[PDB]
Amino acid sequence: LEVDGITETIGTTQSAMYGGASAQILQINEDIKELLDGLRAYFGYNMIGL
Partner 1 sequence: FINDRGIKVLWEEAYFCPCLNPDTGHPRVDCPRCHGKGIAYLPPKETIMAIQSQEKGTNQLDIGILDTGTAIGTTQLEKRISYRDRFTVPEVLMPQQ
Q: What is the 3-state secondary structure (H, E, C) of 6-32?
A: EECCCCCCCECCECCCHHHHHHHHHHH
Would you count residue 37 as binding a second copy (CB under 8 A)? no
Handedness of CA 8, 11, 14, 20 (dihedral sign): negative
As measured in angstroms, the least distance from the Cβ of 10 to partner 1 is: 11
As measured in angstroms, the least distance from the Cβ of 3 to partner 1 is: 6
Would you count residue 37 as binding partner 1 (CB under 8 A)? no
Would you count residue 49 as binding a second copy (CB under 8 A)? no
Would you count residue 47 as binding a second copy (CB under 8 A)? no
